[PDB]
Structure formats: structure tokens, C-alpha cells
């Protein structure tokens, strides 16, 4: 069915080694579920009706004069999305444990607002957001965003949870903060983890049970 899919990925050294495994087990099947059957080179962008994928990659504060979030424009090709998922290079990090989840979520919110101004042929669609993270959030409010500046991760994930965006978390290391954020993004009113170590909670989307 029509879907506005937004992936939010932590592009840091953590999630570096574990990303290839996560893609085969969880991310790639999730794209197929939105796009029935695996994509191969015939899928064309430009159908404004239909499922539209997008990436948001974020970083920590060690990329000091560079920007924090790299966003990609929406595509209707699942194949271009797969090439974008290959094209991420995980180079960041340093002496820290946290990352800028608030930035990635705020730009995901701006993506969903631009999607909502885009699709008017349908009032509401399946608005799905995934967060592929390996790290607890920073305590910084969001700085490099307009209309969602000065907001912590809890406020932003409340605004994700209300208005009916289906929020999911795929993490290769089981963590408390990520679980708390997932519990908070509750939509108004099954073991999918193939590996025991992986923590995967999916509010929306169907992934083969393992």
C-alpha cells in the first residue's frame, strides 16, 4: 500500500561493523514488504503517488565544522534506496558514547511535513519511521533544525508518537534509553529479532518472525 518510509541511521563507528548484518536480517526485508518483491533496475522515480523512501543519516559532535545530518531526497525506487544504503560510510566517532538522535528525528519530522504537503490525493497514509541506532542519545536539544529547535529527544519522540507516525527501533546492542524512547512514541490509542543480542521493536511493518 502507499507508504512514506523514512530511515534514520547513525553514521558513526558504532553501527559500523554491525550494519551489514542488520541490513540483510531486518532493513532489506522491511523495504521488500513495502515494495512487494525485491527491486532490480526497473523501478522508476517520479510517481508522486506511491511509496516514497528517504534517508536521514546523523553523526556525533566530533564532525565539528561539518553539518550534523545528511538527508536524502525522497525516491520512489526501492533500488535507489538500496544503493543509498550501500553508499553510507561509517567513519565518525571518537572518545564518546552518545550521538545526535534529536537532529535525525527533527529532520525526519521535517521530511514528514514535506511529505504531508506533497500527498494531498490521500489524506493520511502509512507513515513509517525507523531508527537504526547503536548509541544512547545526547542531552543536547536540537540545534540545526528550523521549527523544531530547542527540543529534546523526548519531546520530538512525543510528536512522532502523536499524529500517527509508526516509530521503530533496530539496534544491534540492547539498550535502556532506546527502549524508553520506543515506549514514549506510542501511536494514539512477536519476536522479530533473529539474533538474541539485537534489540528490534517495530510498531509498524511486518518482518519474518525468527
Amino acid at each position: 500500500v502507499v507508504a512514506d518510509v523514512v530511515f534514520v541511521i547513525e553514521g558513526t563507528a558504532n553501527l559500523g561493523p554491525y550494519f551489514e548484518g542488520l541490513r540483510k536480517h531486518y532493513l532489506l526485508p522491511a523495504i521488500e514488504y513495502f515494495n512487494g518483491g525485491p527491486p532490480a533496475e526497473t523501478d522508476f522515480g517520479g510517481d508522486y503517488g506511491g511509496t516514497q523512501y528517504s534517508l536521514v543519516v546523523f553523526n556525533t559532535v566530533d564532525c565539528a565544522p561539518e553539518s550534523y545530518v545528511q538527508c536524502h531526497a525522497p525516491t520512489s525506487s526501492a533500488y535507489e534506496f538500496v544503493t543509498w544504503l550501500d553508499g553510507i560510510k561509517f567513519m565518525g566517532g571518537g572518545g564518546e558514547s552518545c550521538s545526535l538522535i534529536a537532529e535525525g528525528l527533527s529532520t525526519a519530522l521535517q521530511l514528514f511535513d514535506d511529505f504531508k504537503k506533497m500527498r494531498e490525493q490521500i489524506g493520511q497514509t502509512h507513515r513509517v519511521c525507523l531508527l537504526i541506532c547503536n548509541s544512547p542519545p545526547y542531552l543536547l536539544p536540537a540545534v540545526e533544525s528550523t521549527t523544531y529547535s530547542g527540543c529534546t529527544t523526548e519531546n520530538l519522540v512525543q510528536q512522532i508518537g502523536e499524529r500517527g507516525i509508526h516509530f521503530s527501533i533496530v539496534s544491534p546492542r540492547k539498550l535502556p534509553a532506546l527502549r524508553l524512547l520506543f515506549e514514549k512514541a506510542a501511536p494514539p490509542a512477536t519476536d522479530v529479532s533473529q539474533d538474541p543480542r539485537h534489540m528490534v521493536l517495530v510498531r509498524g511493518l511486518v518482518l519474518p518472525v525468527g
Binding site: 558504532n14 566530533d62 564532525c63 565539528a64 567513519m91 571518537g94
Partner: peptide, 15 residues
């Protein structure tokens, strides 16, 4: 150990 080597791809630890 790419968790350790991939931290210092773009910079040193000092910056």
C-alpha cells in the same frame, strides 16, 4: 576491531 579503527578515520583523537 572496526569499532576502534573506524573512530579515527577522518581525524585523530586530539582532533
Amino acid at each position: 576491531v572496526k569499532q576502534w579503527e573506524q573512530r579515527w578515520i577522518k581525524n585523530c583523537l586530539c582532533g
